[PDB]
Amino acid sequence: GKHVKGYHYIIANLGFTDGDLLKIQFGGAEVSGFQIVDYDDSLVSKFIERW
Amino acid sequence: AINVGNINNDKKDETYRSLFQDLELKKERRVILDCERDKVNDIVDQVITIGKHVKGYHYIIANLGFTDGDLLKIQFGGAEVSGFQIVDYDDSLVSKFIERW
Structure with a gap:
């Protein structure tokens, strides 16, 4: 607790949303953390769809 | 007293955080449950x-199944x-029954 x-x-990694995060939402x-793979960037979204 | 019965499975997480943002109004540090064991573990989480x-x-916990659920999580x-238990697991009649169950 x-x-x-x-x-x-x-969080000291470039993958904030990469790991499970909702558990402490x-x-x-x-x-606070760091996201190098901005899931809001356009290239990543078309990537996520295929992914 | 708060009625916790009438709720559906989809809008479950919303009406719950709002129930304790309502029990936060009374700053209620002391709560009684008094529900079925299936609804006990859902509230605990x-x-x-x-x-x-x-x-x-x-x-x-107002039911006869204190140890019948899982308690190591909130340990x-x-x-x-607090709670209540009717099946005594230190009795030889239940031991001779647990040794076979």
Whole structure:
């Protein structure tokens, strides 16, 4: 129970959304990370469809 | 007292976070459940997702199947949990029954 409102974590990899992330989406603790593969970029979306 | 019966399976996670953003109004650190064992394990899970199980909360499970569910998950949170059990697993009549079951 160390993920409530008060704790703050930093993911130090270029794959934030690569791993499972929803598990702490509602813990209240703010979570920040890094995304090199911007799933919002156009090239990646057409890639995701085929993927 | 909060009616938790009338809910469907699709809009389940929404009406639950809103139920504890409503139990957060009373700052209710002491909650009683009093439901069937199938609905017990479903309620337990969403509590851990929001994080209402650290040192400060106290829950009372109102059914005869305390150990009949799974309890090792909420065993390291911090809150006090209470319940009721009728099947004594230290009796020789149940031991001679558990040794065969």
